[PDB]
Amino acid sequence: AMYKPDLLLHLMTKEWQLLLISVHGQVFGKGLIKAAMTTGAWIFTGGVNTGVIRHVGDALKDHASKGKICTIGIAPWGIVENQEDLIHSHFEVKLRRQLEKHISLQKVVALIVEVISIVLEYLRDTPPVPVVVCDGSGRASDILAFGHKYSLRDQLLVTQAQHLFIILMECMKKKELITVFRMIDLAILTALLKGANSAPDQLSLALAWNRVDIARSQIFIYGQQWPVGSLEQAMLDALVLDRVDFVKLLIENGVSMHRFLTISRLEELYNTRHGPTLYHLVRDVKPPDYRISLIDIGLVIEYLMGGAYRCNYTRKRFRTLYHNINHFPFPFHELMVWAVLMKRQKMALFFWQHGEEAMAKALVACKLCKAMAHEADISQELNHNSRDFGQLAVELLDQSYKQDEQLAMKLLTYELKNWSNATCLQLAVAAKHRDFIAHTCSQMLLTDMWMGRLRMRKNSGLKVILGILLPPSILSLEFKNGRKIYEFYNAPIVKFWFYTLAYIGYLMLFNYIVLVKMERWPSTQEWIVISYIFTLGIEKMREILMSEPGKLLQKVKVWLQEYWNVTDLIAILLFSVGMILRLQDQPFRSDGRVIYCVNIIYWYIRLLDIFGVNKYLGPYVMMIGKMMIDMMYFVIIMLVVLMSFGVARQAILFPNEEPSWKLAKNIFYMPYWMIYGEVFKTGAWIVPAIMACYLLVANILLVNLLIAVFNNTFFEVKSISNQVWKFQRYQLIMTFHERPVLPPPLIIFSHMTMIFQHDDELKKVHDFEEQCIEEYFREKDDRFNSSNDERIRVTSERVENMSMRLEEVNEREHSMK
């Protein structure tokens, strides 16, 4: 601790380097310390520990160490027992007065503990006089009695009398100036507010305090001024600040967000740095302190969302309009987007508590959180923020299904003008939130879509196979379970079976072609295969062409994300090259045949991407994909172990040898029978036997290690494959549904046909969503309040208070008797 108003204050502050509080003289004391610590106002108290300071110090030792409030301790120098030591922290009266005046000057609280003349002089001098009432007897007690009474002279004489009467009259002259204290933080806040004495100034002081509960009492009053313009600035400051209860009070105070929302205000909010990766991300997507506008924010939003996405504000027309009402029809959407952008979670939760199309916003937030984490505390927010948003969306879906299955199904799928017309399912898939898709309602909708118009659900595979095999007879009956045949064909399941059968036929023809013979000119089967590939290429080019979003230049970039499509293109190119080489005479025909012979391997393996649909078949594919990398890593160990012994054995043998580029085969031969025979002057025979035995042991060791590795990996994969399988169904269904009805070799005519061809419900849905969210909040609150842990705490607190009251009442009963 460190030990002429201006000069004295400067000297005291220099050594210590530290409104106002001053004490002149358990729960209340603790509350006062908490208020002082929160405000940070230095407490002016006597420097002598004994007396009132002892009571002050008892509470100070309670929680001072547990901000280090710069309490001011002033005591006479002569009182110091040791002069050398004399020469609380930063350790006369006029100095305090002028220090208070200086503090008040910049854009003054006194507490009495057990004096009256000093209080009166301070009240007269300083414009404010908010003296804190003192329960202890003395001059403060007399002042409090005089203030309450506003008879008195006789009592004062019974308890000098003339001086007391004069002091009481002087206090009455400044009646209501002295702070009234009655059995603490709220009372202190009210006293400080009264001492400060414009409505915007009071609102700013309350916001600075941040005590929403205390601030409400001061702000809440009738016949207030509320000058125009102050409310907007206060709301802007509150939104910039992390305070939430203040914003809620503004909303309940009559402040309209729709009226508040404006382009300039939002731009200033976005470009502000007064708060807790937006800048770096914007710079990368897009210039220090560069003026950020809605256009750039929308552009970075679209960047983060992914390809084939759009934003209502993130569009060229919006940018042109901004460059050239000016009120967002749905301010909550933009506010929530910003709140999640700047990593403000509680405000995002509150905004989501009140909004239209909450489920869509929640899924977008989960997508944004994951994307931000991947692009980039980052691990912490990714695990919590994105997961929490997804869980909220799942809970909302579950509640809606309970309230109404049909309405939940309808809500799941409907165009959103705000979000570039993307349904909830598409957003969930983009976010890869398997939980949302795994829900019963989503699976039911996917099954209904997959079955198409036909309602059959028993022996579906056999029925589809029969319908494909026997159209004219099957279709008429299958329609119940003309137009019936057409709607049967248009169903995705029959398209899937049609494509599967066509692919099987193509495979059989390919096997028959390459496997037998070759001639100068290709046979009919090779022509059929070439037609297959040509039609498939036409289909791929058409699919890319219909992938219009992003224009022609930016359509291929998104379309290229899928690996299987790129592999298909590569295989098509290699097949075409091989076919071209085939018709180049015998010397080139023989060399080119092998290329498209090897090309068959890709087509046989492409069925794996289609074998993930089945419930019992996808786990095998997933396990293979997982174990590929494990085998890759195992190969290194296998080589390191085996090659050493192989090289040693080879070197021991063939002492005289020439390289001839033919040692790799010798080392890598690794024969079992030959080594075993080699196993069974003296040392030259012993050493090779030892080498052979070591190799033989190592082989089986590695084999068993591989077996164990595969078993463990398969178990780990199977623990999750069942849950994972459901996700791919939506992709498959939405893929086959869009595709035309004819097989790949026959869609050539399909393209010809294509060329030849060329609000109350919304209000009800909004009301249902509002009711669902309100019910969710009510249920959450009721369940939490009914928890045993909370009830036990409540009972314990009530018991303590009830017991204390009973004990006090016991003394009264004894006195009465």
Ligand X SMILES: Cc1cc(NC(=O)[C@H](c2ccccc2)N2CCCc3ccccc32)no1
Binding part of the chain for ligand X, among 156-164, 305-313, 415-423, 534-542 by CB under 6 A, reads: 534-542
> Cβ closer to ligand A8W: 617 or 643?
643
Q: In the complex, what is the shortest distance from the CB of residue 414 to ligand X, in angstroms, rounded to a whole number?
A: 27
- Select the binding partner of residue 59 from ligand 6OU, ligand A8W, ligand X, none (C-beta < 5 to 8 A, by kind): none
- Selected from 394, 744, 750, 769, the binder of ligand X by CB under 6 A is 744
Could you give phi then psi for residue 690, rounded to 5 degrees?
-60, -45
Looking at the DSSP assignment, which residues form a beta bridge with residue 111?
Answer: 23, 132
Instruction: Check binding of 694 to ligand 6OU (CB under 6 A).
Output: yes
**Contacts with ligand X: how many residues (CB under 6 A)?**
13
Those residues whose C-beta lies under 8 Å from the C-beta of residue 70, and which sit 6 or more positions away, are 16, 18, 40, 42, 89, 90
> Cβ closer to ligand X: 322 or 727?
727
Here's the x/- map for ligand A8W, 647-666, by CB under 6 A: it reads as ------------x-x-x---
> Cβ closer to ligand A8W: 610 or 642?
642
Whether 217 has a binding-site annotation, put simply, is no
What distances in angstroms separate CA 442 from CA 401, 415, 428, one per listed residue? Answer: 10, 17, 11
Query: What is the rounded distance in angstroms from the CA atom of residue 133 to the CA atom of residue 115?
Result: 13
- Select the binding partner of residue 499 from ligand 6OU, ligand X, ligand A8W, none (C-beta < 5 to 8 A, by kind): ligand X
Task: Using DSSP bridges, classify how beta strands 43-46 and 131-132 pair: parallel, antiparallel or unpaired.
Answer: unpaired
> Cβ closer to ligand X: 16 or 499?
499
**Contacts with ligand A8W: how many residues (CB under 6 A)?**
3
Could you give phi then psi for residue 328, rounded to 5 degrees?
-70, 125
> Cβ closer to ligand 6OU: 93 or 708?
708
> Cβ closer to ligand A8W: 444 or 652?
652
Centroid of chain to Cα 366: 6
Q: In the complex, what is the shortest distance from the CB of residue 288 to ligand A8W, in angstroms, rounded to a whole number?
A: 55
What one-character DSSP code corresponds to residue 386? I
Q: What torsion, rounded to 10 degrees, do the Cα atoms 376, 382, 385, 388 define?
A: 150
Q: In the complex, what is the shortest distance from the CB of residue 747 to ligand X, in angstroms, rounded to a whole number?
A: 9
As a residue count, the chain comes to: 817
Residues 659-698 that bind ligand A8W (CB under 6 A): 659, 661, 663
- Selected from 48, 115, 698, 741, the binder of ligand 6OU by CB under 6 A is 698
> Cβ closer to ligand 6OU: 679 or 748?
679
**Contacts with ligand 6OU: how many residues (CB under 6 A)?**
5
Q: In the complex, what is the shortest distance from the CB of residue 642 to ligand A8W, in angstroms, rounded to a whole number?
A: 12
Where does residue 793 rank: exposed (0-12), middle (13-18), buried (19+ CB within 10 A)? Answer: exposed
- Select the binding partner of residue 536 from ligand X, ligand A8W, ligand 6OU, none (C-beta < 5 to 8 A, by kind): ligand X
Query: What is the rounded distance in angstroms from the CA atom of residue 604 to the CA atom of residue 607?
Result: 6
Whether 615 has a binding-site annotation, put simply, is yes
Residues 287-306 that bind ligand X (CB under 6 A): none
Residues 702-741 that bind ligand X (CB under 6 A): 739
Could you give phi then psi for residue 547, rounded to 5 degrees?
-80, 65
- CB distance 451 to 491 below 8 Å: yes
Here's the x/- map for ligand A8W, 610-649, by CB under 6 A: it reads as ----------------------------------------
> Cβ closer to ligand X: 202 or 535?
535
Those residues whose C-beta lies under 8 Å from the C-beta of residue 749, and which sit 6 or more positions away, are 742
> Cβ closer to ligand 6OU: 16 or 694?
694
Those residues whose C-beta lies under 8 Å from the C-beta of residue 143, and which sit 6 or more positions away, are 116, 119, 131, 167, 168, 171, 178
- Selected from 145, 574, 610, 641, the binder of ligand X by CB under 6 A is 610
Token code pair at residue 671: 């024969």
- Select the binding partner of residue 659 from ligand A8W, ligand 6OU, ligand X, none (C-beta < 5 to 8 A, by kind): ligand A8W
> Cβ closer to ligand 6OU: 546 or 697?
697
- CB distance 83 to 127 below 8 Å: no
> Cβ closer to ligand 6OU: 199 or 693?
693
Binding part of the chain for ligand 6OU, among 126-134, 543-551, 691-699, 808-816 by CB under 6 A, reads: 691-699
What distances in angstroms separate CA 501 from CA 127, 233, 497, one per listed residue? Answer: 96, 70, 6
Query: What is the rounded distance in angstroms from the CA atom of residue 318 to the CA atom of residue 722?
Result: 45
Q: Strand order of the sheet with strand 43-46? A: 72-74, 43-46, 21-24, 110-112, 131-132
- CB distance 178 to 130 below 8 Å: yes
- Select the binding partner of residue 565 from ligand A8W, ligand X, ligand 6OU, none (C-beta < 5 to 8 A, by kind): none
Binding part of the chain for ligand 6OU, among 354-362, 381-389, 390-398, 693-701 by CB under 6 A, reads: 693-701
Instruction: Assign residue 43 a region (left: φ > 0; alpha: ψ between -120 and 50; beta: otherwise).
Output: beta
Amino acid present at 633: Y
What distances in angstroms separate CA 633 from CA 622, 627, 640, 707, 712, one per listed residue? Answer: 18, 10, 11, 15, 15
- Selected from 1, 607, 637, 701, the binder of ligand 6OU by CB under 6 A is 701
Q: Which of 505, 498, 511, 500 is nearest to 601 (CA)?
A: 511
Residues 637-666 that bind ligand 6OU (CB under 6 A): 641
Grouping H, G, I as helix, E, B as strand and the rest as coil, residue 222 is coil
Binding part of the chain for ligand X, among 29-37, 315-323, 535-543, 629-637 by CB under 6 A, reads: 535-543
Query: What is the rounded distance in angstroms from the CA atom of residue 651 to the CA atom of residue 653?
Result: 5
Q: Which of 113, 74, 75, 91 is nearest to 1 (CA)?
A: 91
**Contacts to ligand X by CB under 6 A:** 499-500, 503, 506, 532, 536, 539-540, 543, 607, 610, 739, 744
**Contacts to ligand 6OU by CB under 6 A:** 641, 694, 697-698, 701
Binding residues: 460, 615-616
**Contacts to ligand A8W by CB under 6 A:** 659, 661, 663
